[PDB]
């Protein structure tokens, strides 16, 4: 087979601040029937938009951080498990996580602790309170945003030894794959008895019932590590079932797995020395740092923007990655680096954000 997915650019706009847009995420927590909403992050700004019929990109709310020198690199949506109220977490150059109420567009609270900039934020797929942050300080941190606790710090002697660029939980939230500037990819199992007990303990913590601080777990050893996939920085990693997708400067998203071809991901030991490359989703001119690929909810489509305004899309249901390419999405007015893309939960819309502050709306044909 081949890819048949087609899209048409229905709209575009440029944010008035004129600064690079570094991140974009649709709210996948919105219920069926409710409008399709996405957040963009860039400079000290967080902006909410609604995707209307006829291709309209309606500005909903604009958050401006009081710190003019803040540079947001990422955002991630969640919800309050007690009130069903949507929440948006943002972070960047200041190394501070800010939790925004997306209805009032006000910062509710912030998490200080990382010793440098935050590159990525990911919420656990089953538990909306479990927030993972990845930093230029060489560590990953797991936070419980309901009890305001630091659950764990993933770092130390066998942790990343350079700026951590990206991380992803697997579909069921049992494990994390992370990657760094020093070409290393590391696995951290969070379904261990130690991690499961730390999560339970973070739920029981309340500073009003004790004068003692909550003790975070210090995870110094990953459950697998490799520097034998890419030859340079790895700025984006995602799970594809039990397989991994990661990219470097090579103009390809590499599909690989820990161990040999037949090895089960859950039988992989921390001393595993083998790795297997399965295939490559190739593209052009995307060899500058901080360019992220995305997938739709069902993981049927893969997308990546490049440094000259082209949006590559692949069909993940075509076995051979070399043959999975969709028609590349281009526009004569879209010539700036596309930092990140986001599909709506139903995969009907694909949004791209650029270095020139522009937003591009691509609607999928049936």
């Amino acid at each position: 087979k081949k890819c048949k997915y087609s899209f048409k650019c229905v709209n575009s706009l440029k944010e008035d601040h004129n600064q690079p847009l570094f991140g974009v995420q649709f709210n996948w927590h919105s219920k069926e029937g409710d409008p399709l909403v996405f957040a963009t992050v860039g400079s000290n700004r967080v902006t909410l938009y609604e995707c209307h019929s006829q291709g309209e990109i309606r500005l909903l709310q604009s958050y401006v951080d009081a710190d003019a020198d803040e540079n947001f690199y990422t955002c991630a949506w969640t919800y309050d498990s007690n009130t069903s109220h949507p929440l948006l977490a943002v972070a960047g150059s200041r190394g501070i996580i800010r939790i925004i109420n997306p209805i009032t567009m006000q910062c509710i609270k912030h998490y200080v602790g990382h010793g440098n900039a935050i590159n990525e934020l990911k919420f656990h797929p089953r538990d909306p309170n479990l927030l993972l942050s990845v930093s230029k300080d060489h560590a990953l941190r797991l936070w419980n945003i309901q009890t305001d606790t630091l659950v764990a710090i993933f770092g130390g002697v066998e942790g990343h030894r350079d700026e951590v660029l990206s991380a992803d939980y697997d579909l069921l939230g049992e494990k994390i794959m992370s990657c760094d500037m020093d070409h290393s990819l590391k696995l951290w199992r969070i379904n261990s008895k130690r991690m499961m007990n730390a999560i339970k303990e973070s739920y029981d913590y309340n500073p009003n019932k004790t004068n003692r601080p909550f003790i975070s777990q210090k995870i110094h050893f990953p459950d697998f590590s490799t520097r034998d996939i890419h030859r340079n920085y790895v700025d984006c990693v995602r799970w594809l079932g039990d397989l991994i997708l990661s990219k470097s400067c090579e103009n390809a998203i590499v599909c690989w797995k820990p161990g040999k071809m037949e090895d089960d991901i859950d039988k992989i030991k921390p001393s595993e020395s083998n790795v297997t490359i399965l295939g490559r989703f190739d593209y052009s001119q995307c060899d500058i740092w901080y360019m992220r690929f995305s997938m739709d909810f069902w993981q049927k489509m893969l997308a990546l923007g490049n440094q000259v305004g082209k949006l590559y899309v692949w069909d993940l249901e075509v076995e051979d990655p070399h043959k999975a390419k969709c028609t590349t999405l281009t526009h004569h007015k879209c010539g700036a680096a596309i930092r990140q893309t986001s599909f709506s939960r139903d995969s009907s819309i694909l949004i791209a954000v650029c270095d020139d502050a522009s937003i591009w709306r691509w609607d999928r044909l049936r």
Partner: peptide, 28 residues
């Protein structure tokens, strides 16, 4: 590899989708 990995994706995303279907998150 591809076929069994695709089945793992289908099954695991369907669990996430069923969990989402039970939710009524307030719109923005």
């Amino acid at each position: 590899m591809f076929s069994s990995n695709r089945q793992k994706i289908l099954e695991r995303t369907e669990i996430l989708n069923q969990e989402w279907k039970q939710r009524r998150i307030q719109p923005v």
